[PDB]
Amino acid sequence: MNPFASLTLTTLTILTIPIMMSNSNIYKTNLYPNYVKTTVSYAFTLSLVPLLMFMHTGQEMIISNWHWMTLQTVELSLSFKMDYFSVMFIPVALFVTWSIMEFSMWYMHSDPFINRFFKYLLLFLITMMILVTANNLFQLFIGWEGVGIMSFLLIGWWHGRTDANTAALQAILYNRIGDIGFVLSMAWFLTHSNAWDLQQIFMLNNECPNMPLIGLLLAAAGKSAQFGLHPWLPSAMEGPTPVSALLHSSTMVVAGVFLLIRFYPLMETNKLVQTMTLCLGAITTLFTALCAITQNDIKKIVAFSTSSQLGLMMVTIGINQPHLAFLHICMHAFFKAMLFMCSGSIIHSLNDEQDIRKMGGLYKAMPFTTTALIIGSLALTGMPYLTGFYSKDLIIEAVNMSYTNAWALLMTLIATSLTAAYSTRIIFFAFLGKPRFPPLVLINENNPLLINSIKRLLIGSIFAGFIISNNIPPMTVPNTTMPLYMKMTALIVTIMGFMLALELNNTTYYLKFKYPSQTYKFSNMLGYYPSIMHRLPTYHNLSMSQKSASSLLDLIWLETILPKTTSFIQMKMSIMVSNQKGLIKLYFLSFLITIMISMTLFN
Amino acid sequence: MLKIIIPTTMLLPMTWMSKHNMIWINATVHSLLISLISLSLLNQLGENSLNFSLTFFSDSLSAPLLVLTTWLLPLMLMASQSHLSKETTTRKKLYITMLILLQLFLIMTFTATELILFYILFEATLVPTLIIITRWGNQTERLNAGLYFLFYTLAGSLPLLVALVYIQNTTGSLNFLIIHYWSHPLSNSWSNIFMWLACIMAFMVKMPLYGLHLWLPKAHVEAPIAGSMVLAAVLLKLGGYGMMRITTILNPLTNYMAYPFLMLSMWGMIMTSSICLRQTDLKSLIAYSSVSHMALVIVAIMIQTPWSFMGATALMIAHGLTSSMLFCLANTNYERVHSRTMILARGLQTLLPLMATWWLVASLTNLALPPSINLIGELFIITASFSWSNITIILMGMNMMITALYSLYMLITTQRGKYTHHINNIKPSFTRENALMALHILPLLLLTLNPKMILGPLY
Amino acid sequence: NVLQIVRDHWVHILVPVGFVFGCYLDRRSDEKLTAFRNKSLLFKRELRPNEEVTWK
Amino acid sequence: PDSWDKDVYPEPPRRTPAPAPQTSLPNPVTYLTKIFDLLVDRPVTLAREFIEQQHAKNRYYYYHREFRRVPDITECEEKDILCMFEAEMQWRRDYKVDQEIVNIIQERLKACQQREGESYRQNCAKELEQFTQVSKAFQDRYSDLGAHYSARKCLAKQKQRMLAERKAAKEAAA
Amino acid sequence: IRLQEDPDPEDENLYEKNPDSHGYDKDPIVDLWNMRVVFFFGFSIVLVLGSTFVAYLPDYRMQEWARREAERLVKYREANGLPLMESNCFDPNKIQLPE
Numbered sequence A: 001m002n003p004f005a006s007l008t009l010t011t012l013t014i015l016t017i018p019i020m021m022s023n024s025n026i027y028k029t030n031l032y033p034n035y036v037k038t039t040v041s042y043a044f045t046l047s048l049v050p051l052l053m054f055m056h057t058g059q060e061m062i063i064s065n066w067h068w069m070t071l072q073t074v075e076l077s078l079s080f081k082m083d084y085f086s087v088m089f090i091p092v093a094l095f096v097t098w099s100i101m102e103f104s105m106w107y108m109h110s111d112p113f114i115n116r117f118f119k120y121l122l123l124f125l126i127t128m129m130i131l132v133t134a135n136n137l138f139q140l141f142i143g144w145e146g147v148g149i150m151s152f153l154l155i156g157w158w159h160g161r162t163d164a165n166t167a168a169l170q171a172i173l174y175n176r177i178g179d180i181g182f183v184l185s186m187a188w189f190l191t192h193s194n195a196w197d198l199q200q201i202f203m204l205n206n207e208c209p210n211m212p213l214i215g216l217l218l219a220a221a222g223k224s225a226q227f228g229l230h231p232w233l234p235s236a237m238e239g240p241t242p243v244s245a246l247l248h249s250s251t252m253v254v255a256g257v258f259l260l261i262r263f264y265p266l267m268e269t270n271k272l273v274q275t276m277t278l279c280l281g282a283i284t285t286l287f288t289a290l291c292a293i294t295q296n297d298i299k300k301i302v303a304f305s306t307s308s309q310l311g312l313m314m315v316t317i318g319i320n321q322p323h324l325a326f327l328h329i330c331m332h333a334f335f336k337a338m339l340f341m342c343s344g345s346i347i348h349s350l351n352d353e354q355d356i357r358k359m360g361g362l363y364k365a366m367p368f369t370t371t372a373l374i375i376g377s378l379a380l381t382g383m384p385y386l387t388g389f390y391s392k393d394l395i396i397e398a399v400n401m402s403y404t405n406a407w408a409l410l411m412t413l414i415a416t417s418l419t420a421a422y423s424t425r426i427i428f429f430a431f432l433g434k435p436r437f438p439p440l441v442l443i444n445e446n447n448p449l450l451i452n453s454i455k456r457l458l459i460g461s462i463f464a465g466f467i468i469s470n471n472i473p474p475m476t477v478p479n480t481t482m483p484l485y486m487k488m489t490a491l492i493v494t495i496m497g498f499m500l501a502l503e504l505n506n507t508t509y510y511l512k513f514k515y516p517s518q519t520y521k522f523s524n525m526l527g528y529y530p531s532i533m534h535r536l537p538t539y540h541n542l543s544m545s546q547k548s549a550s551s552l553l554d555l556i557w558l559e560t561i562l563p564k565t566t567s568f569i570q571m572k573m574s575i576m577v578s579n580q581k582g583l584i585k586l587y588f589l590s591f592l593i594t595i596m597i598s599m600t601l602f603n
Numbered sequence B: 001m002l003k004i005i006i007p008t009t010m011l012l013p014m015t016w017m018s019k020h021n022m023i024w025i026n027a028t029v030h031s032l033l034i035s036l037i038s039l040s041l042l043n044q045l046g047e048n049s050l051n052f053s054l055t056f057f058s059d060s061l062s063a064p065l066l067v068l069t070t071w072l073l074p075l076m077l078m079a080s081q082s083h084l085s086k087e088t089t090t091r092k093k094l095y096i097t098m099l100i101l102l103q104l105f106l107i108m109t110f111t112a113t114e115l116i117l118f119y120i121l122f123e124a125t126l127v128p129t130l131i132i133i134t135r136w137g138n139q140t141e142r143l144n145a146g147l148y149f150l151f152y153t154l155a156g157s158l159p160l161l162v163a164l165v166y167i168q169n170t171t172g173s174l175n176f177l178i179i180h181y182w183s184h185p186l187s188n189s190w191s192n193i194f195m196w197l198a199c200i201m202a203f204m205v206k207m208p209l210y211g212l213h214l215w216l217p218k219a220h221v222e223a224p225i226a227g228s229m230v231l232a233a234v235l236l237k238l239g240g241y242g243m244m245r246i247t248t249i250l251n252p253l254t255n256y257m258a259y260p261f262l263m264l265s266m267w268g269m270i271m272t273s274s275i276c277l278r279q280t281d282l283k284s285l286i287a288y289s290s291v292s293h294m295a296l297v298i299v300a301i302m303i304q305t306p307w308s309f310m311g312a313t314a315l316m317i318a319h320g321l322t323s324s325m326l327f328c329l330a331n332t333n334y335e336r337v338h339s340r341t342m343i344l345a346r347g348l349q350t351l352l353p354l355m356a357t358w359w360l361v362a363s364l365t366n367l368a369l370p371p372s373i374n375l376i377g378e379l380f381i382i383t384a385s386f387s388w389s390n391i392t393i394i395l396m397g398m399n400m401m402i403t404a405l406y407s408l409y410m411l412i413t414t415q416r417g418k419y420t421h422h423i424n425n426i427k428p429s430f431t432r433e434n435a436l437m438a439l440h441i442l443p444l445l446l447l448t449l450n451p452k453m454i455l456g457p458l459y
Numbered sequence C: 001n002v003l004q005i006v007r008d009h010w011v012h013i014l015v016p017v018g019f020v021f022g023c024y025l026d027r028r029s030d031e032k033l034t035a036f037r038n039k040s041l042l043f044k045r046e047l048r049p050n051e052e053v054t055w056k
Numbered sequence D: 001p002d003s004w005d006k007d008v009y010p011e012p013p014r015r016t017p018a019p020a021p022q023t024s025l026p027n028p029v030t031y032l033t034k035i036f037d038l039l040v041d042r043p044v045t046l047a048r049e050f051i052e053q054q055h056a057k058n059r060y061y062y063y064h065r066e067f068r069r070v071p072d073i074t075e076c077e078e079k080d081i082l083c084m085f086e087a088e089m090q091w092r093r094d095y096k097v098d099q100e101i102v103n104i105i106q107e108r109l110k111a112c113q114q115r116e117g118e119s120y121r122q123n124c125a126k127e128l129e130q131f132t133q134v135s136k137a138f139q140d141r142y143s144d145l146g147a148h149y150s151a152r153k154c155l156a157k158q159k160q161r162m163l164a165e166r167k168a169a170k171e172a173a174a
Numbered sequence E: 001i002r003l004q005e006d007p008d009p010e011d012e013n014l015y016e017k018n019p020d021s022h023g024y025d026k027d028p029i030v031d032l033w034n035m036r037v038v039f040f041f042g043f044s045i046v047l048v049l050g051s052t053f054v055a056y057l058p059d060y061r062m063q064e065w066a067r068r069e070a071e072r073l074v075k076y077r078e079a080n081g082l083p084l085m086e087s088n089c090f091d092p093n094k095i096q097l098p099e
């Protein structure tokens, strides 16, 4: 037949296999994490094979194996789209997951439920694969909700932490707004096309309208934490560092960008939705970078960097460049996962300390971690020949040479400069200078698991963008001709951010103390958005839920109208009827009145 | 249908002639056997129903409800075993007799072929439920709950009886097949408006509809566990089945009279979800969630499109199973601590892991996690409502968000956090309780695997 | 003790015999609705050489 | 297997370009294909051969039920329950068959779009027109009849449409 | 005081008198056999047998029959050049409009 579909489905099945084995003594013992890691590595190789098959002849297939149910003229069946996006994203996700699982084997060694942690990680991976390979809207929604609820479970890993519980609930709330948008899109598509599958959707929607494309955009914004629905992603750092490295930054937050990429024909057909996507991405990346440049929690800094990169991807989608966004997704997955692993290594070595104000001296204290973090920050800022160069530089060049929003372009450039700035902040406050941690030095990073995982994600932060960009067919016309000052715009702004951040960090050694500014307070407090938008709407909704619906309507007026008024009327009438004194004279006079009335007024 | 009806009327003498320590075993075993026998009704045709005789017939809408009732009886028996340890033999046999009579009446109601017999049985179901509530409830408010339940139902249903006898006199027969084939349009006059009001209002009070729903929290909070299980899962579906049956003769007047009820149902979804957000009682939370789901089913039935009836049936079955499971979990927690306050007991995930897993699964099914039949029905209803109008999508989206909010809120409140220090009577979960939860949850996933069996006759 | 087993476990035949009786009654009711047997336009058919009723 | 009708499920002829390498490096795709054929395809082929040999030991057949044609609701008299029942059953069977026809056309359209790939907007325009015609006819026939649709309601809709068409034609050519 | 009332008894724990209790009955043998019959009948019989029975229920909904009929009609229609879907469900010759 063809070893393409068989091997793709085999990768999915072998991913699903260890979940079945969770009911066995292998799950009861302490070999389960290693078993899961081995399974993930084998899946990574078996997924590399179809990637080699695609890069030769560009083979793309769809498999509709199982027919679920036929709703009259609409057939829902289990269908997989093994196209370029799927066959390119599966190996990257499997590689990152393998590295994160080894890192978690090292990291969550003292956790009593490490087996359950690895089971949850594998379930998240399965749901993400379902989302990526889904061919119809219903299966895509299945994957969407699966990754959402797995994120909910893994954020609140420590059930006894109120902050973890509220972070998980907040993530669920924002993802449910995204799901509202997704359901709007699904309903419109079914109503106006009689199909939930991409083939018929693309065939019939030659000019996709504002309502379905806005539904898709809202779902993508909710999933990728764009402006308005962003705060859940920084708050999602309450979970263990492996969760932040694997789930959010690498593979889950790119779900909205991937969804917008999957509907790039419709996005091309529309213009207003493209403009809205561009503006949303620009404001998101600018705001998140501006918040990042002044944070003291390293995990939060990396989370805001991830949000800024997502905003850049959304900008790339808004300028009608779907494939550059996918390339950036892959490269960002690589170096962001490596950065999160390095931050987790630092945190673990310093006894669960997540403050750069207490980190210091780590350049010589932790050699390999320092090298890996430097390489990751160089790739993040767009070093001219690293993984981030083959995506970010092309994105900036395409934004410059486009009929786009001038404000959006300016905000994108400022966001790149701020990216360089917060990378400088992380490096300076974490590795340079003198120690600020407690005197008991427990620094030890000589674990083979940690070293090997960071090393594997480190070779992929140097030699992966080149291979990927040289092994993919040209899906877009290049921008060969451009002015010299526009060809090096990204480098100039990156160097300016480097220099300004370094100067402002060097000014902290002076024996001068000044109170903070309004701009500093705005930037450090996350723009005051979490405070206002997490206190006012919640208070008003929870107040109207009790004052108006429960007490005023249900407990008072709905009781007053039907049952209480009728009961009172019946009680009063019963009292009036039975209040007779039993006097024969009185009720015989009543008999006489009744007799007269019957005789006279009855004809 | 006699092959299913007679075994229940044999459950009665078996229960009354069994030994004192074997009543539960015999009742459970033979209820399971009757459920297995009733599974054969799922082999429905594609064009016309199964007409066994002049009195009983089975359809693609009746069969899943009959299977649900026959499956729900043994679970109620297990819960009764749980909470009726110290009762006397005669009172235990009376409780089992009430459950058996209720199941028999429900089976005959679902398989009745005429509207008057349907009404007679659908009103006959009131007596066992009222007796169970007002006799084996635990708190003082059970008498008030029984009064509210009985009088709401009767005030709803008496004009239905008047309308039914009037319809028979006018047309000739109340047989469903005849009134479907010989159906004629209903003119827009005051008399037709009031006949429509009689029938629809009866079934809406039974449903319930927002504004006519206080009896539901009153009865479900104060009823015993078996009463709550049967009230939420099956007795609420009598209104939906009746509306899906009675609307054949109400067109095209239904296209004009549906607006007040549609607005009431949608705003009631919103209001009851918001009420669920701020409830200090777990059973009240579950009851109001049931109200919201039934309001969604009302919206589907009133918009009355082929994609809305399938969603209505799927949502009815899924909600019945989910609400029964939630009530069972809440009853286990109550029996451990003897209080219905939600914030009284915490850390139950630390103290009882498997019950935490059951709570997680039940709450995930409640918030319509794909590809569960809850989500299937809700999505079909949402798509039909979107075709009807394009702001129903806004209302459904906000309702879905609040539903997820309160489901995860109750999960986090009960299971997560620091355990209460002074509560030291949390014994390990019983095999009976674990098996009850498993028997509640597995059929949901199996119906997810095979969804065409619960999508009604319009599939 | 065999009598005691019967004296205690004789109630376990009530539901099976009720099921058998219900099946018998269903067949007996079905035998009363044979007015259109082998007379419908869709399923009208000549009887086989060894056959007297299309269905029972 | 190809146990389906090619005319009912059309498929354009498959043109596969011949491999013309321009480099001396070996082909990992070719080597992996050889490995896959040696390790998977041959064992599954042997297993299928054994299973099909076992199936041919006892071969039995099943048939497609043929339904006779009966007079329809137009010929049925008013309040004639038996004829109305027969016509309603026939109409429901026809409705299901039409639904499956629409499904067949939609499957054709989806397969054509996926097959054409990057040039679908032009290549698979013949399936789009057939789907448009079938969808329009199906909508005109079984349009919004409601959840309680019936042959009588469909007949009433058709009569209304015929009256509207006749009035439009008269007011045009009058 | 207002009545000669019994004090509220303490709740009994089934695990105290029987550490192997399944929660069905306070009698050990009756509890064990109640658990066994519930598990066997319910899980094994109902779940497995009813699930496979429903899975292998005969196709009385005529889905496959409808698909085969649709294939036959499509083949006949497109072979002879006729439209795949007819314009009207009924025959205008048999339908008599009022005029």
Ligand SMILES: CCCCCCCCCCCCCCCCCC(=O)OC[C@H](COP(=O)([O-])OCC(O)COP(=O)([O-])OC[C@@H](COC(=O)CCCCCCCCCCCCCCCCC)OC(=O)CCCCCCCCCCCCCCCCC)OC(=O)CCCCCCCCCCCCCCCCC
Pocket: A293, A294, A410, A413, A414, A417, A418, A421, A425, A492, A493, A496, A497, A500, A501, A504, A505, A508, A514, A515, A516, A517, A518, A519, A520, A523
């Ligand atoms: C409603 C407004 C809406 C605005 C929307 C638009 C927003 C635009 C944003 C523009 C960029 C903002 C930069 C960051 C601001 C916050 C800084 C901060 O909090 O630092 C603390 C934080 C360190 O905090 P810390 O170490 O914890 O200690 C804090 C101190 O204790 C205590 O800290 P502190 O408070 O003492 O230090 C802050 C101080 C020092 O920080 C700075 O000066 C940062 C900016 C550096 C200079 C940038 C411009 C100069 C370079 C470009 C020149 C033009 C080039 C043109 C050509 C380009 C192409 C070749 O800054 C100020 O006092 C005012 C800064 C005002 C910036 C302008 C935007 C906000 C205006 C708000 C109105 C009120 C202003 C007055 C303040 C409030 C009232 C009292 O600083 C950093 O981490 C580094 C910050 C600087 C990074 C600069 C990176 C590059 C920026 C872009 C350059 C251009 C790129 C190319 C663009 C495209 C060209 C085509």
Ligand SMILES: CCCCCCCCCCCCCCCCC[C@@H](O)O[C@H](CO[C@H](O)CCCCCCCCCCCCCCC)COP(=O)(O)OCC[N+](C)(C)C
Pocket: A019, A020, B039, B064, B067, B068, B071, B317, B443, B446, B447, B449, B450, B454, E046, E047, E050, E051, E052, E054, E055, E056
């Ligand atoms: C392991 C983790 C589990 C949880 C997470 C889920 C992740 C996915 C797990 C998937 C496991 C199953 C995959 C393999 C499924 C094999 C069986 C399946 O293919 O058959 C289904 C069939 O399953 C059964 O139909 C489900 C039965 C559901 C009804 C059970 C009722 C039991 C009594 C309980 C009463 C409850 C009353 C509720 C109201 C009715 C679908 O029908 P179908 O493929 O075509 O049948 C093929 C036979 N044909 C070809 C002749 C047609």
Ligand SMILES: CCCCCCCC/C=C/CCCCCCCC(=O)OC[C@H](COP(=O)(O)OCCN)OC(=O)CCCCCCC/C=C/CCCCCCCC
Pocket: A163, A166, A167, A169, A170, A171, A173, A177, A180, A214, A217, A218, A221, A227, A228, A229, A235, A530, A531, A533, A534, A535, A537, A538, A541, A542, B397, B398, B401, B405
């Ligand atoms: C249409 C559907 C509704 C749309 C949104 C309307 C407002 C939503 C109303 C929310 C109801 C509130 C229910 C309360 C549940 C519990 C709340 C709670 O847990 O507390 C707040 C909780 C956590 O508090 P923390 O800040 O983390 O404090 C931790 C301190 N250590 O935070 C929240 O979850 C509240 C978030 C509410 C969201 C409101 C903002 C959403 C509005 C933006 C929409 C616009 C999007 C723009 C994109 C457009 C794309 C085209």
Ligand SMILES: CCCCCCCC/C=C\CCCCCCCC(=O)OC[C@H](COP(=O)(O)OCCN)OC(=O)CCCCCCC/C=C/CCCCCCCC
Pocket: A041, A042, A045, A048, A052, A055, A088, A091, A092, A095, A455, A456, A459, A460, A463, A464, A467, A468, A471
């Ligand atoms: C067209 C040319 C380019 C085509 C794409 C080439 C992608 C190359 C990807 C890496 C090459 C494949 C290496 C195979 C590794 C898997 C082998 C394996 O299963 O394990 C062996 C072995 C040991 O595993 P343990 O976990 O330690 O188990 C110990 C057992 N006691 O695996 C290894 O560690 C090998 C070391 C890997 C070196 C680092 C490679 C870094 C690669 C970076 C880029 C890879 C990106 C992934 C795909 C890129 C395209 C999307």
